[PDB]
Swiss-Prot record, chains A, B:
Function comment: Transaldolase is important for the balance of metabolites in the pentose-phosphate pathway.
pH sensitivity of activity: Optimum pH is between 8.5 and 9.5.
Organism placement in taxonomy: Bacteria, Pseudomonadati, Pseudomonadota, Gammaproteobacteria, Enterobacterales
UniProt miscellaneous comment: Mutagenesis of Phe-177 to Tyr increases its preference for fructose-6-phosphate over 70-fold.
CDD domains, A to Z: Transaldolase_TalAB (cd00957)
Superkingdom as given in the UniProt entry: Bacteria
Record protein name field: Transaldolase B
Length: 316, 316
């Protein structure tokens, strides 16, 4: 068979895009979006109806332009999620405003608002994953949300400290980026070419995977952000993997069966004491890569949120 | 019997021309064209209908003159291929614009366009071979095309590095030139007269043939470009051989049976590691003949593409 079909034996395939065409082509279990993908999705001509629906609904909720821009941008994200849910049997990941990444209370509020919008469309909490950046504040937000029945996808995870803190908060899922870790090592280091096994992102996810299974953590590990299929194949065995359409296409067109790389065959060991904020900040900041990338990811997603608000504002 | 009939026992005979008269005379399994042959074919008075069909079809697809010239030149190549397919049971080779030889993405696009035109005429992919120059970029284009169901004919092959890279990409067929290799040695060397066995082109193809069969490569080896029948006879046994009408005539008029020269009777050996771009460029450039000829072939085919576009432009 082809690589994609072979991968499904060990790993749950998730599509990373806001485009419904890829859902029809690759039949993933779940789908994920982020502010950059939602902004890109808004440029697709077929999605014009969704934008008009967002704007029309916003104007019916209030006569205040400020609230209208926020209501329409949230609704558009939810609308794109609604279309995807019609084609996937699993969950959809929708991300909260990145500008709230360092605000626990604002993140809880925004997450509940997106959930309310989905609930308004008849969709229940078991089909949604609220996406939050893995800062200490987002993690503390997620821990509280999980207790309230809202499942979260802790994204932009780069350091081991983030992985440990997320697991201890009892979050549903974490999204360790693989490709962005490679980007950093390509830019800030001597070595520009890495073999799949020596790829920093792969090594990072593998280490996180083993740590989670070793201590019996129920938190799902979903590798995200890929630059090539080599990284995907080397992670065959990971709980789930969110892959972009271009690489999903490469897997489907490449023949040959693949072997499982990620496994933990031993017994569950005792969990250590919970990491504190001070220890988290110390450990996270020891990692130069994670320092740059966590901050940078939040910035880019914020710019894309503003760019969406700009677009929506011109239509009111 | 005659040499041509005797040759068919060991080698699949392919006609190298765009002229349908030769298909009727020699009954080849396949046929091949290239930009120089397509330009020559366009001068044949019987082919005027095909040109008028190309121009008329182009004008119906768009009102933009730039697109019309491109649509008509592609259609003419496809039209000549359509006439040939009515007389041959096998495949037809149609070559992509040589000006795209160092552009992988443009080559994939152009190949898919020619395939689309053939499909528009009801012809399926199994009857077509898309011809691409054997540069690293064309090889990478071909590897991707094969995965998508488009079979390719890697032409203008001169060096062993090209042969190795083509085999590893899993391409359907390769066309090592024999006569152009001889031309180079006649121009850039002391020896002007070569016996069939010491002919550089023959020795080149023989070496490539053995390498392919020795490692179990499914890639078909088709010798092309001949200067005399001695080269053809010395290659009796090669998978296929694309011969020009003049030499095809010489074989049919010469009596006597011939013996098979090219064979591999041993077992299939293990394939080495895949050659990288750096190693390819190094090995290819070590061969002075291949350096000159690959570059020169692409230039000549480019000039002929422009000459065709000139002709077509004067008819719009």
């Amino acid at each position: 068979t082809d690589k994609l079909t072979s991968l499904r034996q060990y790993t749950t395939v998730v599509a990373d895009t806001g485009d419904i065409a890829a859902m029809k082509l690759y039949q993933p279990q779940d789908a994920t979006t982020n502010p950059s993908l939602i902004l890109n999705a808004a440029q697709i001509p077929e999605y014009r109806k969704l934008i008009d629906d967002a704007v029309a609904w916003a104007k019916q909720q209030s006569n205040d332009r400020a609230q209208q821009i926020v209501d329409a941008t949230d609704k558009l994200a939810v609308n794109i999620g609604l279309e995807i849910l019609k084609l996937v049997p699993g969950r959809i990941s929708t991300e909260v405003d990145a500008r709230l990444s360092y605000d626990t209370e604002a993140s809880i509020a925004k997450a509940k608002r997106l959930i309310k919008l989905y609930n308004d469309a008849g969709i229940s909490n078991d089909r949604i994953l609220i996406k939050l950046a893995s800062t200490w504040q987002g993690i503390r937000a997620a821990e509280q949300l999980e207790k309230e029945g809202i499942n979260c996808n802790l994204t932009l995870l780069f350091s081991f400290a983030q992985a440990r803190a997320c697991a201890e908060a009892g979050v549903f899922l974490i999204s360790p980026f693989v490709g962005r870790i490679l980007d950093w090592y390509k830019a800030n280091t001597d070595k520009k070419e890495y073999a799949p096994a020596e790829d920093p992102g792969v090594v990072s996810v593998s280490e996180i995977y083993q740590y989670y299974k070793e201590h019996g953590y129920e938190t799902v590990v979903m590798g995200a952000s890929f630059r090539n299929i080599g990284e995907i194949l080397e992670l065959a065995g990971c709980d789930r993997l969110t892959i972009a359409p271009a690489l999903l296409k490469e897997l489907a067109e490449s023949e040959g069966a693949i072997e499982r790389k990620l496994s933990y065959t031993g017994e569950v060991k005792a969990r250590p004491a919970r990491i504190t904020e001070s220890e988290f900040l110390w450990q996270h900041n020891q990692d130069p890569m994670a320092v740059d990338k966590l901050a940078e990811g939040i910035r880019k997603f914020a710019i894309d949120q503003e760019k969406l608000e700009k677009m929506i504002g011109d239509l009111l």
